[PDB]
């Protein structure tokens, strides 16, 4: 339920180019421990130029934690 909602909202944010919403959704996936969603959203955020590769690695680590 909520994983699906987060992933679909991130896809919409990526299509719209909304970097802040991408980062907000990324932060949600990270805090909730959704590793797959974090990795997917972090990569969209990286391709959008919203985060760096080092930030991506830190977000993924926090989600796994």
């Amino acid at each position: 339920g909520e994983v699906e909602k987060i992933v679909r909202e991130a896809a919409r944010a990526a299509r719209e180019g909304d970097k802040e919403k991408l980062k907000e959704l990324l932060a949600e996936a990270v805090a909730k421990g959704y590793v797959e969603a974090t990795k997917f959203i972090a990569e969209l955020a990286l391709k959008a130029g919203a985060i760096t590769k080092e930030e991506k690695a830190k977000y993924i680590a926090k989600a796994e934690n």
């Binding site: 994983v3 992933v7 990526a14 997917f40 959203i41 990569e43």
Partner: protein, 66 residues
């Protein structure tokens, strides 16, 4: 990179093709690549996320064909 990152990277390129009004055959080529890759990844490491990525790609292609 793992499986979902590879899919996200391709999905970003797919969104670019849609936004730039690339030919439908190019949209379909990349969407179908994503769909097949997500299906294979789902069998290896099932997750709701992979199912949703697959559905997102199928939905984008369906809308692009209309």
């Amino acid at each position: 990179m793992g499986a979902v990152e590879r899919l996200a990277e391709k999905a970003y390129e797919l969104l670019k093709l849609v936004k730039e009004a690339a030919p439908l055959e190019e949209v379909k080529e990349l969407a179908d690549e994503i769909i097949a890759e997500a299906e294979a990844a789902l069998a290896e490491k099932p997750s709701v996320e992979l199912k949703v990525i697959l559905e997102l790609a199928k939905e984008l292609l369906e809308e692009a064909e209309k």
